[PDB]
Nucleic acid binder design. Structure first.
Ligand SMILES: Nc1ncnc2c1ncn2[C@@H]1O[C@H](CSCC[C@H](N)C(=O)O)[C@@H](O)[C@H]1O
Ligand SMILES: [Zn+2]
Ligand SMILES: [Zn+2]
Ligand SMILES: [Zn+2]
Ligand SMILES: [Zn+2]
Length: 472
DNA sequence: GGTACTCATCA
DNA sequence: TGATGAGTACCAT
């Protein structure tokens, strides 16, 4: 129902198509992903819209031009100016068409001038796509240039999105929707390359979140023992307790099996050598239904959720680099444990996390549920659970949300007993720096009874729009 | 139907 | 570094 959720699910569907095209090794799988979205009538906003799109807030970060196409936010994958064609002329009979609704500024036009709240934006045309990429002939008042002129004359604002470079390993560039701007005036003049260009002076409208630019409270330098490949610092700027999240608690990197929990028969595994790449020859690809569930992109991303993923294991002939061991690899991201206002400790990332990336296995002591307060994860892909109450990895610090950005994935690798699957958290969405990582704990309402005559209730503080207000 | 256009993306 | 990329937008040589 709710538009932010619609946007989320559209973007997840695009990400699925994208990764499937990457697996098929198709040219420009981003664009192919869009074509698949069009075929499936899955473009969220299939017609042009003036102003804001519901579910797309000012500040929204897009991870490719293609994503913007998938949502319907900006319909060309290349073109800087998106406008209503003459098809829209009866719908908007009092405006003069064409009429622009969205522009992208990515530093490609030498005449562009970016001063944040004020922008001088170059029209389209005569722009070289090959070479030093300069203007190579005069522009005229046509196409997008006309569209922008009409915006100026009819007081129709345009959405403005900026491309930004990232020094991250996995995402090279991001596009931020920076809000509505009015087209104040336009004119022709000689550009820096000596040919005529049209220029559009844009001024950011008020009534919007401010444009923004861009270790305090450290309580522990690395909550792992140096056991994670990337250290995980902890902070507390909520109060000044000097207490670390590690007090009382022993960080571990591998599961601990309680003595009365059975150790199932080891998986037979595959006979591939080095890395598994041929899905015909690989028994582990066969277990998954014939294809690998992970794609070899950004050190391994899960294409889509499954009842269970079958990874290579102890007896496979392949080494640790195998893409079908994706969730077994080193922590890829710089993370931080921080004190939340009302949920206790919480986890966020300092880096971008691509959708489908593994975040972590839930590590703790595996116990029979019959033998077992707030750090237990039942394995239900329930006879067995993972207890991180006294020992575990960082997973136990991740909070619940009614609108999460991580999801739970069961993985079999050491053995084939589904009751004892590994529990692994993957990014459901593309996650930006400093966003809290969360998953849905999945408790039923009124499942919990206090030791007396009361249903026991626990308030949710996830802050989501559709919060429902109770963990249970 | 025919096609000129184009502010990305790939190590 | 540049070759490709595909959904138009508009005319229908
Ligand atoms: N969305 C949410 N709202 C309120 N409390 C939450 C919450 N998500 C997690 N919690 C709290 O965190 C517990 C899960 S363990 C998660 C780590 C915990 N926040 C800590 O400080 O160690 C829950 O029992 C609950 O007390
Ligand atoms: Zn393998
Ligand atoms: Zn194999
Ligand atoms: Zn294998
Ligand atoms: Zn909630």
């Amino acid at each position: 129902l709710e538009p932010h959720l619609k946007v989320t699910k559209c973007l997840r569907l695009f990400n699925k198509q994208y990764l499937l095209c990457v697996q098929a090794k198709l040219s420009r799988p981003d664009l192919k992903g869009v074509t698949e979205m069009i075929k499936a009538k899955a473009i969220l906003y299939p017609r042009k819209i003036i102003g804001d799109l519901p579910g797309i807030d000012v500040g929204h970060r897009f991870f490719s031009r293609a994503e913007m196409c998938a949502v319907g936010f900006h319909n060309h994958w290349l073109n800087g100016i998106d406008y209503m064609s003459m098809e829209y002329e009866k719908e908007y009979s009092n405006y003069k068409l064409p009429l622009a609704v969205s522009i992208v500024m990515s530093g490609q036009y030498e005449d562009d001038l970016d001063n944040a709240d004020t922008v001088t934006y170059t029209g389209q045309g005569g722009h070289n796509l090959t070479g030093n990429k300069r203007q190579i002939k005069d522009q005229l008042l046509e196409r997008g240039n006309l569209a922008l002129k009409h915006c100026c004359e009819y007081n129709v604002p345009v959405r403005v999105t900026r491309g930004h470079n990232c020094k991250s390993s996995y995402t090279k560039r991001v596009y931020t929707y920076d809000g509505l701007y009015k087209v104040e005036k336009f004119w022709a003049q000689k550009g820096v390359s000596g040919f005529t260009v049209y220029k559009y002076r844009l001024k950011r409208l008020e009534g919007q979140p401010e444009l923004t630019t861009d270790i305090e409270g450290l309580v522990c330098e690395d909550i792992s023992g140096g056991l994670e490949f990337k250290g995980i610092p902890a902070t507390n700027r909520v109060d000044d307790s000097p207490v670390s999240p590690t007090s009382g608690f022993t960080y571990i990197k591998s599961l601990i099996i309680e003595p009365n929990v059975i150790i199932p028969k080891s998986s037979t595994g595959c006979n591939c050598r080095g890395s598994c790449t041929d899905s015909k020859k690989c028994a582990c690809a066969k277990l998954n239904g014939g294809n690998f569930p992970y794609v070899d992109l950004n050190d391994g991303r899960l294409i889509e959720s499954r009842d269970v993923v079958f990874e290579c294991g102890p007896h496979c002939g392949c080494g640790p680099k195998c893409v079908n061991r994706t969730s077994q690899k080193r922590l890829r991201f710089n993370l931080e444990v921080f004190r939340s206002a009302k949920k206790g400790w919480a986890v966020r990332s300092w880096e971008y996390i691509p959708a489908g990336s593994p975040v972590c296995e839930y590590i703790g002591v595996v116990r029979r549920t019959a033998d077992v307060n707030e750090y237990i994860f039942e394995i239900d892909c329930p006879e067995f659970c993972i207890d991180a109450g006294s020992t575990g990895n960082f997973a136990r610090f991740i909070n619940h949300s009614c609108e999460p950005n991580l999801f739970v994935q069961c993985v079999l690798s050491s053995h084939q007993d589904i009751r004892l699957a590994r529990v692994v958290l993957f990014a459901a969405d593309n996650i930006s720096p400093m966003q809290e990582l969360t998953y849905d704990y999945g408790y039923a309402l009124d499942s919990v009874h206090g030791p007396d005559g009361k249903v026991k209730q626990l308030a949710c503080y996830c802050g989501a729009l559709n919060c429902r207000k109770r963990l249970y």
